[PDB]
Structure 1
Amino acid sequence: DNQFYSVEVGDSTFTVLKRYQNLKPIGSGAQGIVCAAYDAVLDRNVAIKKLSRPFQNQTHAKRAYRELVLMKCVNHKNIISLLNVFTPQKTLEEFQDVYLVMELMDANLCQVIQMELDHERMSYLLYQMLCGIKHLHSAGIIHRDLKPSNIVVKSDCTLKILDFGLARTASFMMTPYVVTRYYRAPEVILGMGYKENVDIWSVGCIMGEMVRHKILFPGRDYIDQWNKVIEQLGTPCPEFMKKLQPTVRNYVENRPKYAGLTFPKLFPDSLFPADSEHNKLKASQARDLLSKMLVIDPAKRISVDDALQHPYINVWYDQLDEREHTIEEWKELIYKEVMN
């Protein structure tokens, strides 16, 4: 009779359509819990994400609403695709949970970073990240929080980005969970305003970490993080700092100065495959792209288009809503998106 059934998966209770069999947990971010499952109707494996009471506050609601709207209308091979969406609840009054069904991938980028990776696979992963970012920028979406945990890959080295980043507004939370700030651009760190190549910084951080196998710019807060940035890349020029609001100008200009490191010193020959002439050249090219992505001043940083054109990468070449609402308003907005 009923077209749903329920099973326990850790703390949570997954109540899912009967087509979805043999649920297995595979991770848990901020918005919810995620299971792998077999889709008996499609004869394929899927990932199912549970959003619990997403309308419970502004922060969750805006994120859920945005993700649902964007995942449905954005169509690209390097952006995770929405296969199905449902709630087991029958009315707006009873409505609680939303379940998103997506293609099932094999790993996080975190896991891939830890591996020794050849240039063929590093450049291919980067290419795909850039193509995806490009797509988002063309659709009016500047991500600003690209990070390895929200990028997934398959064994065949296919790459998809999982989320659409920050809201243009931006907040307060209760759930004890730490946000990963390590990949954010200087302009996000310092609060400057940004353009599309804000996301290049993040790709630079990811690329660099693939080579060094350590997070480039860690720290408890933006204070420590900014210190790690300037210790490595050196203090930026005056031209840059003229672009900063008065109070953040004063902070940045009064921190201990550093000359920084050359990119050969930041990413030495040691870290690269460089045994054949092929690899010698690809290493050279790799460090050159890195040097162009990890630059503090966005005015001097490489664009997405110039990056896709770069020799390391080009071998692979081939409505609006952002407003405030109460709980009950959000709950209905999300419910009707779910019952399209």
Structure 2
Amino acid sequence: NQFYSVEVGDSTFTVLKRYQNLKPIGAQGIVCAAYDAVLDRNVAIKKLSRPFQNQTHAKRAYRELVLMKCVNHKNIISLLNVFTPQKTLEEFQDVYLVMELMDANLCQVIQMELDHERMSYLLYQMLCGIKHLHSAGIIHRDLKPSNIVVKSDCTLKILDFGLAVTRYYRAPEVILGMGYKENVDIWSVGCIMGEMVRHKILFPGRDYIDQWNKVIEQLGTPCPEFMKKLQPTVRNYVENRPKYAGLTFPKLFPDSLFPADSEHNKLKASQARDLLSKMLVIDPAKRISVDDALQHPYINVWYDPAEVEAPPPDEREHTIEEWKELIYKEVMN
């Protein structure tokens, strides 16, 4: 038999024998670090039990499965291997995802007293990976530090492909039911960029009501041109709020937060504040796009013309049992 079981914490990992001494380490599953004798590199193994028994979850697990193979990019996590220990459909149960092992996730990095070199370089890689996703037709809409993992050389990778509860990093046009274009992901990048700076969540709403309130509390009531763009019932809910003028970005992110040591740092701080003011905009029409973000003086020292400019590479609802077989078929390559 080609598998063997190890227990790690609450979980028992039954994997191919190629993966050795599993040890503990998100996401929508349970995860172990492991050694891969076949490739001779450490890997992460995520376990997905009965992924088909939650409709929403099944669709997303199927998607993350076919896309994660469809996509290839240095800043997206790619599927090294997928397998199931069960040998028949009737008994099919667990899916195991193997990815390359990283050294931390972004929430852990965010906590460091980070400088602009590291900070902009991570953001470069985020925008860079976002841009790619976009050129494939994937618009994420659900980016958050927890689904981002980085190595100790600061190389970065987005772990998932988002939408078709943490609401903190969701764009306004998402939580409000408006259409969206590419830069709907720019919002998220900015809630993160601003979070490396305060070290705290920008818009930590207790719920979806208090979400919007943490937002227009700091940025101010959107202009009528924006409100005109809401559905009649959504307006009234969003209108009726307390009207705010918002705060200037030197106020939302005072010099206190950045390492304004000397000229370089001072300049780099204001640039960061400038980018933040272009990314953290409520109206998608006034919000910066991914490219100009990459070309921003806070970011562009990282711009590698080839690494970016380069060769550019559904949806139904199912019964649980049709998900199970659909997901099963996929794992059977």
TM-score band, normalised by the shorter chain? over 0.9
| Cα deviation code 1:175-220 (max 9, x no counterpart) | xxx9211001111121112111110000000000111111100111
Deviation at 1:279, TM superposition (A): 1.1
Could you say what secondary structure the match of 2:143 adopts? coil
| Cα deviation code 1:270-299 (max 9, x no counterpart) | 111111211111111111000100010110
Deviates more, 1:75-84 or 1:4-13: 4-13
Query: d(CA) in 2 for partners of 1:30 and 1:147?
Result: 12
Is 1:182 the counterpart of 2:168? The answer is yes
Deviates more, 1:114-123 or 1:54-63: 54-63
1:58 to 36, 39, 55: 55
Could you say what secondary structure the match of 1:15 adopts? strand
- Determine the structure 2 residue equivalent to 1:259: 245
Could you say what secondary structure the match of 1:23 adopts? strand
Is 1:288 the counterpart of 2:274? The answer is yes
Query: d(CA) in 1 for partners of 2:282 and 2:120?
Result: 23
Deviation at 1:338, TM superposition (A): 0.5
| Cα deviation code 1:121-148 (max 9, x no counterpart) | 1110000000100011110111111000
State how many pairs are aligned.
324
Query: d(CA) in 1 for partners of 2:100 and 2:46?
Result: 11
Could you say what secondary structure the match of 2:206 adopts? coil
Matches for 1:1-340 after TM superposition, within 5 Å:
2-26=1-25, 29=26, 31-166=28-163, 179-318=165-304, 321-340=314-333
Deviation at 1:31, TM superposition (A): 2.2
Deviation at 1:12, TM superposition (A): 2.0
Deviation at 1:30, TM superposition (A): 5.1
Query: d(CA) in 1 for partners of 2:48 and 2:240?
Result: 44
| Cα deviation code 1:154-179 (max 9, x no counterpart) | 0000000000001xxxxxxxxxxx92
Q: RMSD value over aligned CA atoms? A: 1.4
Q: Against the structure 1 CA distance between its residues 35 and 122, is the aligned structure 2 distance closer, same or farther, given a 3 Å change threshold?
A: same
Query: d(CA) in 1 for partners of 2:254 and 2:318?
Result: 52
Deviation at 1:94, TM superposition (A): 1.8
| Cα deviation code 1:283-327 (max 9, x no counterpart) | 111110001000101100000111111111111111xx2101112
Query: d(CA) in 2 for partners of 1:277 and 1:57?
Result: 54
Query: d(CA) in 1 for partners of 2:269 and 2:29?
Result: 40
Residue identity over aligned pairs, in percent, reads 100
Residue 205 of structure 2 contacts residue 211 of structure 2 at CA under 8 Å; is this kept in 1? yes
Show structure 1 runs of 4+ deviating over 6 A.
Answer: none
Query: d(CA) in 2 for partners of 1:95 and 1:332?
Result: 9
Query: d(CA) in 2 for partners of 1:253 and 1:17?
Result: 56
Could you say what secondary structure the match of 1:35 adopts? strand
Residue 183 of structure 2 contacts residue 284 of structure 2 at CA under 8 Å; is this kept in 1? yes
Query: d(CA) in 2 for partners of 1:67 and 1:195?
Result: 21
Deviation at 1:10, TM superposition (A): 2.1
Residue 24 of structure 2 contacts residue 33 of structure 2 at CA under 8 Å; is this kept in 1? yes
Query: d(CA) in 2 for partners of 1:288 and 1:91?
Result: 56
Query: d(CA) in 2 for partners of 1:58 and 1:305?
Result: 36
Residue 27 of structure 2 contacts residue 147 of structure 2 at CA under 8 Å; is this kept in 1? no
| Cα deviation code 1:28-67 (max 9, x no counterpart) | x352100001111122110000000111131121011001
Deviation at 1:11, TM superposition (A): 2.2
| Cα deviation code 1:61-112 (max 9, x no counterpart) | 1011001100011000000011111001112222111100000001110011
User: What TM-score, normalized by structure 2, do the two folds share?
Assistant: 0.95
Could you say what secondary structure the match of 1:232 adopts? coil
Could you say what secondary structure the match of 2:112 adopts? coil
Deviation at 1:117, TM superposition (A): 0.7
Could you say what secondary structure the match of 2:80 adopts? strand
Could you say what secondary structure the match of 2:194 adopts? helix
Could you say what secondary structure the match of 1:204 adopts? helix
Query: d(CA) in 1 for partners of 2:53 and 2:27?
Result: 14
Could you say what secondary structure the match of 2:33 adopts? strand
Deviation at 1:151, TM superposition (A): 0.3
